[PDB]
UniProtKB/Swiss-Prot annotation:
It is a multi-pass membrane protein. This is Papain-like protease nsp3. May form homohexamers. Interacts with N protein. It is found in: Host endoplasmic reticulum membrane. Inhibited in vitro by GRL-0617. Responsible for the cleavages located at the N-terminus of the replicase polyprotein. Participates together with nsp4 in the assembly of virally-induced cytoplasmic double-membrane vesicles necessary for viral replication. Antagonizes innate immune induction of type I interferon by blocking the phosphorylation, dimerization and subsequent nuclear translocation of host IRF3. Also prevents host NF-kappa-B signaling. In addition, PL-PRO possesses a deubiquitinating/deISGylating activity and processes both 'Lys-48'- and 'Lys-63'-linked polyubiquitin chains from cellular substrates. It catalyses: Thiol-dependent hydrolysis of ester, thioester, amide, peptide and isopeptide bonds formed by the C-terminal Gly of ubiquitin (a 76-residue protein attached to proteins as an intracellular targeting signal).
Length: 167
């Protein structure tokens, strides 16, 4: 038993809720919150800009030091950094950005990073401003992640759509 509430169960291990991941994170304090990161960890908008804003820019400061030391992430890759006031840890995962022409097949590789963590609060990777179809993202998620994932979907309309179309 864990502290996530109001989730609909899609599979043995995947759950989903219409929620703001920032507010979901500040209430739950999960062990891991996933950020929808880019390879530069520049948290300007979308989920990343919202998570970063909620940390009062501390996420960005930490991220800039990470990049200065290690260089950019790979598309499909990830790093574990602090969760600041939102979670114990933040798993920054780089899904492909369709609006940059990145290969959607890398979406499976991106979701594989979730398997290194027993429980995660996460957004749908490559959705929103990353330009992929969220219904496809949820499918890859279900078919790739084996650990327990709690998906927060900010938009009530898309959420209804993801549930109603789920196979
Ligand atoms: C790059 C990239 N690749 O995929 C994705 C998926 C995103 C897209 C935009 C919606 N995102 C969220 N998801 C859950 N909660 C949220 N609160 C938010 C608050 C905001 F001000 C903006 C966004 C979210 C949000 C998911 N972005």
């Amino acid at each position: 038993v864990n502290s996530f509430s109001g989730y609909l169960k899609l599979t043995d291990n995947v759950y989903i809720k219409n929620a703001d991941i920032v507010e979901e994170a500040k209430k739950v304090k999960p062990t891991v919150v996933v950020n929808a990161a880019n390879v530069y960890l520049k948290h300007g908008g979308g989920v990343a800009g919202a998570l970063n804003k909620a940390t009062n820019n501390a996420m960005q400061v930490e991220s800039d030091d990470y990049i200065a030391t290690n260089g950019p992430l790979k598309v499909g890759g990830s790093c574990v950094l602090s969760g600041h006031n939102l979670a114990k840890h933040c798993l920054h995962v780089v899904g492909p950005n369709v609006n940059k022409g990145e290969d959607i097949q890398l979406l499976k590789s991106a979701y594989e990073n979730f398997n290194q963590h027993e429980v995660l609060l996460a957004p749908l990777l490559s959705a929103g401003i990353f330009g992929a179809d969220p219904i496809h993202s949820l499918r890859v998620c279900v078919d790739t992640v084996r650990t327990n994932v709690y998906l927060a979907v900010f938009d009530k309309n898309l959420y209804d759509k993801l549930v109603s179309s789920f196979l």
